[PDB]
Amino acid sequence: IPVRVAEKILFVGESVQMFEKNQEDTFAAELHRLKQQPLFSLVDFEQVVDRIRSTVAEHLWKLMVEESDLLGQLKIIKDFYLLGRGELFQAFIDTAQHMLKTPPTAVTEHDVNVAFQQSAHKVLLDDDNLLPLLHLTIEYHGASGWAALGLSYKVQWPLHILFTPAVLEKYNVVFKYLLSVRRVQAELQHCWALQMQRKHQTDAIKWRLRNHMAFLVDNLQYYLQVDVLESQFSQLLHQINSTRDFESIRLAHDHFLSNLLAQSFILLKPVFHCLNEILDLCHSFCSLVSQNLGPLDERGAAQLSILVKGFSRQSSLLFKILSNSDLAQLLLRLDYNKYYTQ
Amino acid sequence: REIITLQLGQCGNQIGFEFWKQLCAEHGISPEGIVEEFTDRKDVFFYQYIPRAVLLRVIHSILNSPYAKLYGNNWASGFSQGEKIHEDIFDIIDREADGSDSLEGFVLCHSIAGGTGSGLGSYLLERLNDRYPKKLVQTYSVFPVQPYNSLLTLKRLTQNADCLVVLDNTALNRIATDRLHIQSFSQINQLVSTIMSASTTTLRYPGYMNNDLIGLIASLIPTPRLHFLMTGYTPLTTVLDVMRRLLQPKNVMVSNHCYIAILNIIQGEVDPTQVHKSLQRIRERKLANFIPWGPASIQVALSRKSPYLRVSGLMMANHTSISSLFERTCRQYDKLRKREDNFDEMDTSREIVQQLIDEYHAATRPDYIS
Amino acid sequence: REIITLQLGQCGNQIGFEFWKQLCAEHGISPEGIVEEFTDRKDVFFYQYIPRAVLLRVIHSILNSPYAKLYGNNWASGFSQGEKIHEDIFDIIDREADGSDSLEGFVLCHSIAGTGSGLGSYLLERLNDRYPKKLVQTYSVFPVQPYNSLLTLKRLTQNADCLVVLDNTALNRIATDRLHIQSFSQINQLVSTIMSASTTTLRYPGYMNNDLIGLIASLIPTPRLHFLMTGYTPLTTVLDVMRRLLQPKNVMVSNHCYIAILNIIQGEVDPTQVHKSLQRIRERKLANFIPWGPASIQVALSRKSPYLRVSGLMMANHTSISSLFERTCRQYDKLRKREDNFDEMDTSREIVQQLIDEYHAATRPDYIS
Amino acid sequence: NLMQTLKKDYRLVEYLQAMRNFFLDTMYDFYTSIFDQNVSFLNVQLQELDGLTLSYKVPWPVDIVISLECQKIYNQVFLLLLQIKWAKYSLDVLLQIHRMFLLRVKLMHFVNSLHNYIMTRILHSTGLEFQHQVEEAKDLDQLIKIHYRYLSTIHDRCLLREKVSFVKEAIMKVLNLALMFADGWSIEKMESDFKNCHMFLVTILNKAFPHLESLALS
Ligand SMILES: Nc1nc2c(ncn2[C@@H]2O[C@H](COP(=O)(O)OP(=O)(O)O)[C@@H](O)[C@H]2O)c(=O)[nH]1
Ligand SMILES: Nc1nc2c(ncn2[C@@H]2O[C@H](COP(=O)(O)OP(=O)(O)O)[C@@H](O)[C@H]2O)c(=O)[nH]1
C-alpha cells in the first residue's frame, strides 16, 4: 500500500470526526464488494477511495466558502502572515516602536497586543471575527524584541487537517524575515523626509549620495516580492479551482510554500548571509543621521566614512554572487546598467 | 496618514471638482456624500463621509451642482490680498490638521498663469514651510504679463514644494485635436482628472508597498534640486503591450537627454508572472537612455480597477528634457525685460532658476556630482 | 534590428500598399492588424501589430481600403516642397527612429519618372546628414521626364548605400508575354512578389544571412558600383531553377559580364544537390565574371510562408546596366540643345558620366587604376 | 508513449532538437554585442581569442544520452564556428586608394566561401539525415550509437581532430589576415602574403578525405 493513499484515508476520517443522504449506502456496498474479490488489486482499491475523498472534500469546500465566508481563510493568511495588508503594519510599527527596541521582558508581550488591536481599528478595519484569532507571541526566556516576535493563528476544526503546527511554523519564519525588511525601508524613508525637510555644508551631500544608493539596494530587494508572492499565490489559487481531488490540494499547497523558502532567497545561505548585513548596517546609518540635529561634525563624518568602505564593497560582492531565479532580481538591478561600472 | 487637499485659483478649483466627482464615482459614494450598497481603503481622502478639501465666483457654480452637500490678474495684486487674509484661512487649515490623526502631506492644485494662483498660491508655500516644517507640499501645478506670473512663481516651487508634477496646456490642447477632435476648457479637463485619479491609485487600495505619498516620491527625487516629474496616460492585451506605448513621446504631455527613474502603474488584472519577461526585452531593445553616474532602476506596480465602474496605464517620469520648457519661458521673460518699488525681487528670481536649469543640464554629464 | 519603409508619391504609395497587402497575407496577420490563431520572427518588420510605415491624393484611396487598421510635375518643385516640411516629416521619422530600439536600415519605394523623385532627392541628402550609421537601400522604379530622372541619379550615385533597378518597360514586357493583359494595378503584383521574396531570409530566420548588410555587401565590390538587378523565373531540382534564371528573358532590365550572383531558394529542396548545381553552372559556363576579381555565385535556402511548389529569386550586379543610363543620357543631350542659373543640371551630367565611364572600365582585365 | 508525452509536457528528443539550435535568428544578436571581457556581463546578454566555454543543464532521463564528454564536442564546434562568423561579419559591417577594395573582394569571397561550406554542406547535410534517423529510434543503446555517429563524424568533416598543423593551421593563420586587415581602415606586402598563403592553401589541400573537393574549387 503506498503512503500516498494512506494520506487520503486519514483525511477523510478526521474530516468526519471533526464534523461530528445518498453518499452513505453506496460507499458501503463498494466496500463490501471488494471483500468478494479473490485478488486485492491496488489499482481498484484507490478507484473507490479517491471518489470518497473527492466527495467529502467537495461538500466541505461548499461549507468552507459559501455559507462560511478554504479560499477565504487563505486570503486572510496572505494578508496578515504574508504582509498582504501592509498598510496595517506600517502604523503598527509607528506605534509599537519604542516598546520593542529595548530588550523584551515579561510585560511587553501584552503591551503590544493592545497596540496591534488599536492598529486594526486605526485603519477602520472592523470585524469581531478573525481579529481575536491573531495573538502576537514573544519568545521570552528560551537581544532586541524584533528577534523574538511571532504571530500565531488558532486554526478552526475542519482546517486542522491541512494546518498542522509544522506548516504554520514555516509560515511563521517567513513572517519574521518579511517584517524585517519592511521595518528598515520605513525608517529609511523617514531619513529621506529628513533631508528634504533640511532644505536651506559641503559634506552634507555625502549622505544622500549614500542614502539614495542604499535605498535602491533595499527597495528593489523589496520588489520581486509582489512578483513572487502575487504570482505563486496566483497558481495555488488556480490549482484548487481546477482539480476536484483533495490530494492535489495537500501537495500543491505543500509545493506552494516550499517555493517561498527558496524563491525568497531564505534557504540559500550566501544570499541570506550577505543582505543580512545590509539590514543592520543601514540601522546605524539612519540612526546616526537622526541622532543629531546639525551637521555630522564631532566624529560623525568620521563615522560615516566607515560604513561606505564596507557597504560599497558589499554592493560589488552581491554583484559577483549573481553573475535559476536571480535573473528576475538582476534584471531590475541592472536595467540601468550602472552596476556594470563597479 | 491622511492628505489634506487645497485648491486655489479658478483652474485649481475647477480641476479639483472634476477630480472629486471622479474619485467618489470609483467608490460607492453617492453625490450626497453617503455610501451606497451596490475592501477599498477610503480613509486617505475622506473623513468620517466628507472629503478633506479646502476650496478658495466659481464657488457659486459648485454649490448649484447636485454635488452641493459634498463639503486682479497681477502677481503683486494676488500676494497683497494673501497677507490681508493671513489669519482668516489658517484657522480653517489648522483645524483640519488637528482633526486628522497623523497628517502626512498637502496636495495643492493651482495654475502659475492664473493670477490668483500666481499671487495666493506663491504666498502659501512660504507660510506652509514656516508653520509646519515636517510636512511635504506637493502640487499639481499646470503651465500655460503671462511670462511674469510664471517665472516669479517658479522661484517658490523650487525651494518650497519638495515635489511637483507639471501639466502643460499646450500639449493638452494638442492631444485634444488629434485623438479627441474637440476643435474648450470643459472637455480637456476630462483627461486631467484621469491623470490625478490614477496617480493616487496605489494608495486607495491595500497593497504590499506604496502605502504613502512618501512611498512614491522618494524613489524619484534623489537630490533636493531634481524635483520635477512628468506623467503619461496610454489608453485613450499584455503587460509588454502597455509599456511600449509609455516610452513613446507621442503620448507624454510635453513639448544629451535621459530620465532619472521611472514608476509604472498598472490598473488591470494582468498575469503578474510575465512582467519580468517584459522588462528583459525592454533592456534588450534599449528604448530609453539613462544616467551612468548613479544606481537607478525602472519600477512597476499593480492595483485593481474600481469594480463599481480592460487594462489602463500611467507612468511617472523624471526627465531632463523638462528643462527646455523652463528655458522657453525664461527666454520670453528676458524678451519682455528689454521692451517693457524696487524691481529687485524679479531680478533674484531669474538668478535662482538659472541654478535649476544648470543642475539638469549638468545632470546629463558623467560628472554631475560636484 | 529593424528596417523602416517610406512610400513616396502615387507610385511609391501604390507599390508599398500592395506589398503590405501580400506581406500581411503571407504572415498570419488579419487585415485588421489583429493576430490570427490558425515560428516567424516579425519584430524587424512589425511593431507590437502596426507596420513601421511612413506614407507620403492617394491617401484617401489607402484609407478607403479595408486595411485602415494597419497604421506640379517638376523635380525642383519637389525639392522646394521638401524643405518646407523639413521638420514636419522628420519628427515622424525621429519619433519612430528613436522609437525603434535598434534601427538597421532605410528602404525607399519611389518612382523617378514626378514629385516623389524630388522629395526622394530631398530625403537622401538629409538622411546622410543626420544618421551616419544607417543603411539606405532604394527600390527605385524607372520608366520633361529626362530632367527629373537624371537628377535623382546624381543624388542616388553617392547617397544611397545600395540600389535595385526596376524598369517599367521590361516589366511591361512580362505584362503581355506571360499574363496577356494588353495595367498599373497588375504590373505591381509582380513588384510586390519581387519585394516580398527579396527579404524572406530576414523575416524567416535561418543559419546564414540574419541581417540585410549580410546580403548586399557580398555583391557590391565598391561603393561606386552599387546598382543591382533582380530575377524571378517561376511564374524541379535546384539545377532547373538557376538555369532558368540566367536567361535574359526573365531579367527585369531592358562586352559585358556580371559581378556576383545571389540566389534565393524558397522551396523544399534538398541541401544535398546545391553544391553540385554550381559545378554544372561553372563547367557549362553559362555566365562570365570580371577578369580581375575572382567572382562567386551565392544561393540561400529559406522557408515559404505556411499560411499561404518550388520558387526562387535572383539578385545580380550586371555591367550591362550602363546601357539604361546612356539612353536617358542621350535623351538629355537631345532636349538640352532643343528646349535662374541652370548650372546644377550640368553638375549632375558630369557625375553620372563618371559612373558610366567606370562601368565600361569595370569589365576590363585592368580595372586596377 | 514516452516520445508521445515528450513533444509537450521526459521528452529527451525535444531537448536534443533545442540543443543543436541554441547554437550552430537568436545567436546573431548575441555575438554582435561581443564585437564592440566580463563573465557576468555575458550572462544577461545571453539570457536576453578562443574561450567562451558553454554548457547546459540536462535532466537524468536524458543525462545518459547527452553525456559530459558530449558537451565539450558540442562546445568545440561552437568555438570554431564563431571565429568564422567573426571574420565574416568583421569584413562585412564596414562599407592606390580604391586598391584596398580589390583586396576586399579577393578576401571577403574566400572567408564567405568557407562559411558556405561548413554550415550548409556539413552542419546541414548530416543534420538533415540525423533527424530522419532519430525518428526511427527503436532501442536504448542504438540511440546512443546513431547520436555518437553524428558527432565523431561532424568533428571529422569539419577538420578539427587531426592534421591540424598540416592543414587546419593554414586556415587558422590566414584567418589572422581577416583580423589585421580589419583594424587598418604595407598594403603591397599583404598581397605578397595573401597570394602566397592562399596558394599555400590550395597546393597543400591538393592531396585530396574525398569530401574536401567541394571547397577545393576556391
Ligand atoms: N487645464 C486647465 N487650465 C485652466 C482652466 N481654467 C483656466 N486655466 C488656466 O488659467 C489661465 C488663466 O488664468 P485666469 O483664470 O485668468 O486667472 P484668474 O483670473 O486669477 O482666475 C490660462 O492660461 C489657463 O491655462 C481649466 O479648466 N483647465
Ligand atoms: N510600374 C508602375 N509605374 C507606376 C505606377 N504608378 C505610377 N507609376 C509611374 O510613376 C510615374 C508618375 O509619377 P507621379 O504620379 O507623377 O509621382 P508624384 O509626382 O510624386 O505624384 C509615371 O511615369 C508612371 O510610369 C505603378 O503602379 N506601376
UniProtKB/Swiss-Prot annotation, chain A:
Q: Which UniProt keywords apply?
A: Cytoplasm, Cytoskeleton, Intellectual disability, Microtubule, Primary microcephaly
**Where on the tree of life does the source sit, at the highest rank?**
Eukaryota
Disulfide-linked positions: none
Cellular localisation: Cytoplasm, Cytoskeleton, Microtubule organizing center, Centrosome
**What protein name is recorded for this chain?**
Gamma-tubulin complex component 4
Q: Which disease is the protein involved in?
A: Microcephaly and chorioretinopathy, autosomal recessive, 3: A disorder characterized by congenital microcephaly and chorioretinal dysplasia associated with poor vision and nystagmus. Variable ocular anomalies include microphthalmia, retinal folding, retinal detachment, optic nerve hypoplasia, absence of retinal vessels, round areas of chorioretinal atrophy, and attenuated electroretinogram. Most patients have mild developmental delay and mild learning difficulties.
Instruction: State what this protein does.
Output: Component of the gamma-tubulin ring complex (gTuRC) which mediates microtubule nucleation. The gTuRC regulates the minus-end nucleation of alpha-beta tubulin heterodimers that grow into microtubule protafilaments, a critical step in centrosome duplication and spindle formation.
- A GO BP annotation: spindle assembly
As one GO molecular function, the record gives:
gamma-tubulin binding
According to its UniProt entry, this protein's organism is Homo sapiens
Tissue specificity remark:
Ubiquitously expressed.
Q: How does it assemble?
A: Component of the gamma-tubulin ring complex (gTuRC) consisting of TUBGCP2, TUBGCP3, TUBGCP4, TUBGCP5 and TUBGCP6 and gamma-tubulin TUBG1 or TUBG2. TUBGCP2, TUBGCP3, TUBGCP4, TUBGCP5 and TUBGCP6 assemble in a 5:5:2:1:1 stoichiometry; each is associated with a gamma-tubulin, thereby arranging 14 gamma-tubulins in a helical manner. Gamma-tubulin at the first position is blocked by TUBGCP3 at the last position, allowing 13 protafilaments to grow into a microtubule.
Q: Which GO terms describe its cellular component?
A: centrosome; cytosol; gamma-tubulin complex; gamma-tubulin ring complex; membrane; microtubule; microtubule cytoskeleton; recycling endosome
- Similarity comment: Belongs to the TUBGCP family.
Say which residues of the entire protein are included here. Answer: 268 to 657 of 667
Swiss-Prot record, chain B:
One Gene Ontology MF term: microtubule nucleator activity
Q: Which SMART domains match?
A: Tubulin, Tubulin_C
What PROSITE patterns does its record include?
TUBULIN
A GO cellular component annotation here is: cytoplasmic microtubule
Q: Which Pfam families match?
A: Tubulin, Tubulin_C
Concerning InterPro entries, the annotation shows: Gamma_tubulin, Tub_FtsZ_C, Tubulin, Tubulin/FtsZ-like_C, Tubulin/FtsZ_2-layer-sand-dom, Tubulin/FtsZ_GTPase_sf, Tubulin_C, Tubulin_CS
Q: How is it modified after translation?
A: Phosphorylation at Ser-102 by BRSK1 regulates centrosome duplication, possibly by mediating relocation of gamma-tubulin and its associated proteins from the cytoplasm to the centrosome.
Source species, domain of life: Eukaryota
> GO:BP terms for this protein?
cytoplasmic microtubule organization; meiotic spindle organization; microtubule cytoskeleton organization; microtubule nucleation; mitotic cell cycle; mitotic sister chromatid segregation; mitotic spindle organization
Chain positions with Phosphoserine modification: S102
Q: Which SUPFAM superfamilies match?
A: Tubulin C-terminal domain-like, Tubulin nucleotide-binding domain-like
Q: Identify the keywords attached in UniProt to this record, alphabetized.
A: Cytoplasm, Cytoskeleton, Disease variant, GTP-binding, Lissencephaly, Microtubule, Nucleotide-binding, Phosphoprotein
PANTHER family per the UniProt record, alphabetical: TUBULIN
- Record-stated family: Belongs to the tubulin family.
Q: Subunit structure, briefly? A: Component of the gamma-tubulin ring complex (gTuRC) consisting of TUBGCP2, TUBGCP3, TUBGCP4, TUBGCP5 and TUBGCP6 and gamma-tubulin TUBG1 or TUBG2. TUBGCP2, TUBGCP3, TUBGCP4, TUBGCP5 and TUBGCP6 assemble in a 5:5:2:1:1 stoichiometry; each is associated with a gamma-tubulin, thereby arranging 14 gamma-tubulins in a helical manner. Gamma-tubulin at the first position is blocked by TUBGCP3 at the last position, allowing 13 protafilaments to grow into a microtubule.
Annotated protein name in UniProt:
Tubulin gamma-1 chain
From Swiss-Prot, chain D:
Where expressed (tissue)?
A: Widely expressed, with highest levels in heart and skeletal muscle and moderate levels in brain.
Give the UniProt subcellular location, in the record's own words: Cytoplasm, Cytoskeleton, Microtubule organizing center, Centrosome
- State which residue ranges cross the membrane: none
Q: Where is the signal peptide?
A: none
Q: How does it assemble?
A: Component of the gamma-tubulin ring complex (gTuRC) consisting of TUBGCP2, TUBGCP3, TUBGCP4, TUBGCP5 and TUBGCP6 and gamma-tubulin TUBG1 or TUBG2. TUBGCP2, TUBGCP3, TUBGCP4, TUBGCP5 and TUBGCP6 assemble in a 5:5:2:1:1 stoichiometry; each is associated with a gamma-tubulin, thereby arranging 14 gamma-tubulins in a helical manner. Gamma-tubulin at the first position is blocked by TUBGCP3 at the last position, allowing 13 protafilaments to grow into a microtubule.
Name the protein family: Belongs to the TUBGCP family.
Q: What does this protein do?
A: Component of the gamma-tubulin ring complex (gTuRC) which mediates microtubule nucleation. The gTuRC regulates the minus-end nucleation of alpha-beta tubulin heterodimers that grow into microtubule protafilaments, a critical step in centrosome duplication and spindle formation.
Q: Would you tell me the protein name for this molecule?
A: Gamma-tubulin complex component 5
From-to range in the entire protein, with total length: 705 to 1016 of 1024
